[PDB]
Every structure is written in structure tokens, then in C-alpha cells.
Structure 1
Amino acid sequence: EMEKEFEQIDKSGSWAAIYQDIRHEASDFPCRVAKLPKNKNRNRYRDVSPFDHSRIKLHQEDNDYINASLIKMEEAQRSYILTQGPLPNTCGHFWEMVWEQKSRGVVMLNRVMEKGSLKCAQYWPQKEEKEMIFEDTNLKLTLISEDIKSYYTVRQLELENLTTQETREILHFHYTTWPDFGVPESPASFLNFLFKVRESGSLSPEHGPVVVHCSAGIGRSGTFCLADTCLLLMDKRKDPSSVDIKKVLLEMRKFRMGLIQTADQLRFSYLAVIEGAKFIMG
């Protein structure tokens, strides 16, 4: 399978090379809207922008920009919205996107503070009695319940459109033990987290695209979506060994830049997929 290739790359210690090999072949499209001066304060990293063709547009006549990309995998029949961790002034935009895109789940793969620094705003209420209201996009957010586990937390939230008093349940999956720029020692916990997301229905067709993010929404977020899509493919195809992870990644990079930030994450993606495969086949 892809495991065969794994050893090959591992025994010859050529990951770094194979990873750079993908960076060179990766797609490159314009990000003009993201670069407008008008949107300077809406971007966390100047080097991490959404392409124009695949960017998510907010549904407002004001400024429709938000650093977020719709990754649409045709064959896998799955779509994901990869975005940056919300900034102090984009939290309203963030929840507007979730509402407008009909998303059921939000997957956060980073902690608010990492390496002693702020990597994202506290964009969701931490206490039931303290609901948040985003005045700029006229939305109300409320913590309904919370389940704290060893390496991840699942929060049930309620998002309400104050314009129409319409309400929806949003599931928040918080992977809290993923070292920044690194990868877990064992993919098991990662995979276990992925399946929890799958079991909630948030990745299903009857719902809008799941919202995935870390700090930049490319490294850890990339690893999450690459593994999910790969497993889904082996699951659907008549040949579970026909799934080319490198092909899947590149196909994803057509929609957002920098997916998979280090050769290590690439190696981890291979592991996560290979291991997750053991389940996909009985």
C-alpha cells in the first residue's frame, strides 16, 4: 500500500526531500482580495492568505473578506473550510461564516496560548452564564455543555442569528494536546479525535462544510483534512491501495496554500492514514 512507500522514504531518510518536492509542485494562485490594505487587520499572518477563487465570502455589502478557504474534494464528496484562528476583531466575522455556510462543527487544533504566546482569540464562551454577543454581525453565542477529556474537549454551543432569532447547535471539537508545528508521538489519539468528529455528523453531506483551524489554519488543519480525505477514499474505492496521499495533498493545495507545514507533519499524515486504514478494513 502506501506503507510500502513509507518504509522506502524512511529507510532512505528522504522525507525532507519529498516534502520540499511537494512545495515546488504545489499550486499558486492570486490572493489579491486578501492583500488589499482594507483587509490588513483581518489577517493574522501576512504569509498566510486565502486564494481568491476558493475564499469564503462573508454575506455582507460592507467588506466580504475573511481569511478562510473552501477546500472541496470532488471524489471524496467532502468539503472543509480551513481558516486562521479568529483575531480580536474577526470573531464576529468567524461566526457569521459558520452561520452563513451552515456549518455544524468547528475543529480547533491549537490552544489559545502556545509557546507562551497568543495564537487565537477566545472566540467562544467559557461559561454557560456568560454568553457572548457579536454586535458587528448581530449574533449570540452560548456555551451549552462541555466534555473535557485527556487530550481533547467537546463543546456543544448554540449560535443564534439575532436578526431572525433563528438558532443552531454547533459542536466544538478542541484538540488540546498538539504541540505547535509538531506532531503527536502516536497518531492513535489524533485518529481517535478524528472519528469523534466523524461520529457527530459534522463532516456529513447534510451539513455545511466543517470549519477547521489552528493558528494559521494550514499546518495542523492540513494534517487533519488530508488524513480524513485519504481514509474516506480508501473507504469508497475498489482499491484501497490506489490512494496516493501526495496526490491528495497537492489536490488540496489547489484550494489553500501551505497545507502541511513540515516534512514531519507529512510523515505523520502517512502514519495517521496507514494506521487508520487498519480500521477501515474490518
Structure 2
Amino acid sequence: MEMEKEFEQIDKSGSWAAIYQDIRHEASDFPCRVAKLPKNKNRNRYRDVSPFDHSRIKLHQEDNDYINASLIKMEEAQRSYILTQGPLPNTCGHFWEMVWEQKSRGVVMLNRVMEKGSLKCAQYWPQKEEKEMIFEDTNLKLTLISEDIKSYYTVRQLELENLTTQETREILHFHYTTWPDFGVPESPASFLNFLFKVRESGSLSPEHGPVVVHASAGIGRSGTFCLADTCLLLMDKRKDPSSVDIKKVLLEMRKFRMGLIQTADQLRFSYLAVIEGAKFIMGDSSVQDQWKELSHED
């Protein structure tokens, strides 16, 4: 129905909540049997957010192979993502074991450790370079190499070492610090400036494993990031950009993990982000520099 024409119609009618509730009704429902198992109670942050059995990530160990994580595999767009929860004090070792085993090169964090006076994610990475972290359970070592702090986001350079095999790898950490829980980013230009920084780094490249994207539960703010990125990839290789349906792409994504995108305003933002980002795909190179100035990263 073409996205820009569809946007103006819904904004004039004021039916954003109705369009969103229709997506919840049509969404897939698959079993989460392993996640509900009694022994895995302390491996889940929220009892209402669980991964499906068919798309869950398995750890390479005989004891317990569980972690609250899912593989989103987008066939036509040719890109994969791993969406997980913000780790608990006891699952920090499992988190980094997954990164090693799945051969990921980048971690996208869209939340903060403490939001609204409550702990939403453990401090899984070191803040000071002289204070490295050692995860005794999985035999892994983590050290901070450098950091580049901007006004609303931070890019970190980390070194992950497998102590059993003596191998070393560089992991890039992209932390968005000003995205509130159940909220939206400040502007479409600030979101896109961040997305393209992750794209130019080489983390989303097929020579590496799937990028790890998380928040507190890893469904709300993660859904908005992944929907915008996939929609932009689809209009680049289809050669008929007007045929990309946002609502249909979100329904394909929810076949792999429950509740992607939590509010009606998060859905409205995804439209604004894709429409603005379509200008770069159309051949206008100058809009990338206009996003950097409108974001005010100083």
C-alpha cells in the first residue's frame, strides 16, 4: 500500500493503536518448553519473556545448554541477529560463551544498567582498563582496550580471550545511552546516525557470526532497531522500493521471538526512520552528513 501514503492516512485518522493491536492478534504462538523448565527459573529475568524452542540459541555443553536468546533469520534480506535479555549476575559467563561460540563481532546495547531506580542489566563488561573480568565458570577473560564517548552513545573496544584454547578476539560494543524504557529515540536522524556507525564498522558483515542485540528483555527497543535495518536492506536489493510492507516484515520477525516492538509509538517511529533512511538508498549521499549534524554528538 506504499509506506509514506499509509503513514499520512493513519496519522490523519489517529488509528495507531488499532493498527498495532491488529499485529498482536495475528502474531505467532510457538512452544517455550525448555524455558519454562524448573531448573532454568534463575536463568530468566522476566517470567513473561521467553524464547521459542525452535529458534533458541544452544550453549555447547552437556550440563545445561540454556540461555534466554533467539536467532532471527531473515531469508530474503540475507541478515541474521541474536536477540537476548540483559544478563543476570549468574548468566554473565553464559552470555560471553554464546558470543565466542556463535563467532559474533559486535554487541548492540540499547539500555542502561539502572533505569527508573531499578537494576535492569548486570555490569557484564569492565569500566576500567586496569580491572579486567574473569568468568570462572566458562573459563573466559575480558579486558577494556579503549572507548569513544559521544553525547548520546558510546563505542567500546574489548578483547575477549578463551583461556582453555589461548585464542584472542576483538569485540566492538555499541551502547545507546538515551533510549528510555518503552520510549523512542530523540529524532530519526539520531537513530540513523547510530545505525550507520554499526554498519560501517564491519560487525554486520556475513564473514562474521550474527550480531548480538539487547535491552532489558530484548524485545521492545531491539524490535525497533532490527525492523528499521531489515526494511532498508530490502529496498536496496529489490529494485522496486515501494513494495516493502513494514507490518508484514514485523510479523515474519515475530516467528522467531515473541513481542518484538512493545508500543504503538515504537511502531510509528519505525515508519519515520525507514522513510528518512530511504533518501540515502535513493542515491543522495549528502543526507548522511546531515544526520551527523542534527544528532549533535558533541
Q: TM-score range by the shorter chain?
A: over 0.9
What's the offset of the Cα at 1:179? 1.3
Distance 2:41 2:188 in 1: 37
What's the offset of the Cα at 1:74? 0.3
Does 2:164 align with 1:166? no
What's the offset of the Cα at 1:178? 0.4
Q: Tell me, which stretches of 5 or more residues in structure 2 are unaligned?
A: 284-298
Matches within 5 A, 1:109-128: 109-128=110-129
What's the offset of the Cα at 1:279? 1.3
Q: Secondary structure at the residue paired with 2:137? A: helix
What's the offset of the Cα at 1:231? 0.5
Q: What is the aligned partner in structure 1 of residue 189 from structure 2?
A: 188
Distance 1:84 1:95 in 2: 13
Q: Secondary structure at the residue paired with 1:153? A: strand
Distance 1:174 1:80 in 2: 17
Distance 1:280 1:131 in 2: 42
Distance 2:26 2:94 in 1: 33
What's the offset of the Cα at 1:185? 3.2
User: What TM-score results when the alignment is normalised by the length of structure 1?
Assistant: 0.99
Distance 1:3 1:117 in 2: 39
Distance 1:136 1:188 in 2: 42
Distance 1:266 1:241 in 2: 18
Distance 2:271 2:125 in 1: 32
Matches within 5 A, 1:6-21: 6-21=7-22
The CA deviation string for residues 94-136 of structure 1, in whole angstroms up to 9 with x for no partner, is 0000000000000000011111111100000111111101111
Distance 2:6 2:173 in 1: 35
**Structure 1 vs Structure 2 CA RMSD:** 0.7
Distance 2:19 2:139 in 1: 47
Identical-pair percentage: 100
The CA deviation string for residues 60-89 of structure 1, in whole angstroms up to 9 with x for no partner, is 111100000000000000000000001111
What's the offset of the Cα at 1:235? 1.1
Distance 1:63 1:188 in 2: 43
Q: What is the aligned partner in structure 2 of residue 107 from structure 1?
A: 108
The CA deviation string for residues 24-63 of structure 1, in whole angstroms up to 9 with x for no partner, is 0011100000000110000001000000000000111111
What's the offset of the Cα at 1:238? 1.2
The CA deviation string for residues 172-200 of structure 1, in whole angstroms up to 9 with x for no partner, is 00000101110023111111111111111
Q: Tell me, which stretches of 5 or more residues in structure 1 are unaligned?
A: none
Matches within 5 A, 1:85-96: 85-96=86-97
